[PDB]
Amino acid sequence: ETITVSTPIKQIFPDDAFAETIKANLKKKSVTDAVTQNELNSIDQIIANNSDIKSVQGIQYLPNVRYLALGGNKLHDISALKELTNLTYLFLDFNQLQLPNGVFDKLTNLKELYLSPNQLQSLPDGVFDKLTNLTILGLDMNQLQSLPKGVFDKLTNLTELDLSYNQLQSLPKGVFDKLTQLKDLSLSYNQLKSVPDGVFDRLTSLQYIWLHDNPWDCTCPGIRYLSEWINKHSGVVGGPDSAKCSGSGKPVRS
Amino acid sequence: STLQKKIEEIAAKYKHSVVKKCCYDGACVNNDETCEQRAARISLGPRCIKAFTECCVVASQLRANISHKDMQ
């Protein structure tokens, strides 16, 4: 998407907070001034942390953004960016943003994505699947409450995956089973009580992990597998003393 | 082992620049209210807030002169 002629900044970027951010990036004098299409091309990255941004509308017009960093109270229509295949890096930190349908389907290039708590309190089916090159996935603090089986299944080059700070109570079987290259996985600060037998079974290139601060069900006939894995691997950041039972502390023999 | 440094050291363990600014902001000392109260007036995102609150708590304890050991 683009522009025929000169034009005022504020006509492209109706979000007042966004327009201000764009002007600073463009070495503007104000918000009023018209901008050439080439100027939009010049900017390759955007980094803002204002509470007053509610829309990146007009984000689409600048194709050569490779790197987007945004934090705010609320973000309303990240639809503007569903068309940027030039963005390798996307960091979104907001109290709520709204996941359109298929938003991620066209940014094949980006390798690192950090998301935020969305409307549905969950991740929509097939959210990430167009995302092959993505190597880093931050879901920390998204407040997610469940997981859609196969959500991660198309994410092979996935170096790491942060699921800390959500309200997950269980993990779908073979949720992790499609990432050969995963090195570090964080599952701390959730509501896990137990994990699917064999969840971590295919996690070879896996170096570090976090398990503390989940309410694990410590009854004898289930968690033995989990205990065995902990006893039989050393990627446990914070040290296996960390993860703990209801009533007890460490996990333990039995 | 100077406070500025030490906080610099806590800070540095946050990767993202916007989050890093948050932690410096929480460090910066407020007089009439707690890390908690201070955080309410804020409208930034979840990462920011967790960073800003955590930085403020650590810096205040450091001001308290409690050993990292005694540090929660």
What does this structure look like?
The complex is a heterodimer of chains A (254) and B (72). Chain A has 254 residues and is of the alpha/beta class. Chain A has one domain (1-254): Ribonuclease Inhibitor (Leucine-rich repeat, LRR (right-handed beta-alpha superhelix)). Helix content of chain A is 11%, strand content 15%. Chain A has four helices and eight strands, in the order αααββββββββα. An eight-stranded parallel beta sheet of chain A has the order 1-2-3-4-5-6-7-8, with helices on one face. With 72 residues, chain B is mainly α. Chain B has one domain (1-72): Anaphylotoxins (complement system) (Influenza Virus Matrix Protein, Chain A, domain 1). Chain B has four helices and no strands. Chain B has helices at 3-11, 17-27, 35-40, 46-64. In chain B, α2 (17-27) runs parallel beside α4. It is classed as signaling protein/membrane protein. Keywords: repebody human C5a Scaffold leucine-rich repeat, SIGNALING PROTEIN-MEMBRANE PROTEIN complex. The assembly is dimeric.
Main pleated-sheet profile of chain B: none
Report the total helices of chain A: 4
Provide the number of structural domains of chain A.
1
Structural class assignment of chain A? alpha/beta
Distance between the termini of chain B: 19 Å
Shape of chain A: elongated
| CATH domain fold name of chain B | Influenza Virus Matrix Protein, Chain A, domain 1
Neighbour order of strands in the largest sheet of chain A:
1-2-3-4-5-6-7-8
CATH class of chain A: Alpha Beta
Number of strands of chain B: 0
Q: With helices defined by DSSP (H or I, 4 residues minimum), what is the helix count of chain B?
A: 4
Shape type of chain B: globular
Radius of gyration of chain B: 12 Å
**CATH domain class name of chain B:** Mainly Alpha
Q: How much strand content do the residues of chain A show?
A: 5-15%
Helical percentage of chain A: 10-25%
CATH 4th-level superfamily of chain A: Ribonuclease Inhibitor
Protein name (chain B): C5a anaphylatoxin
Subcellular location (chain B): Secreted
Organism (chain B): Homo sapiens (Human)
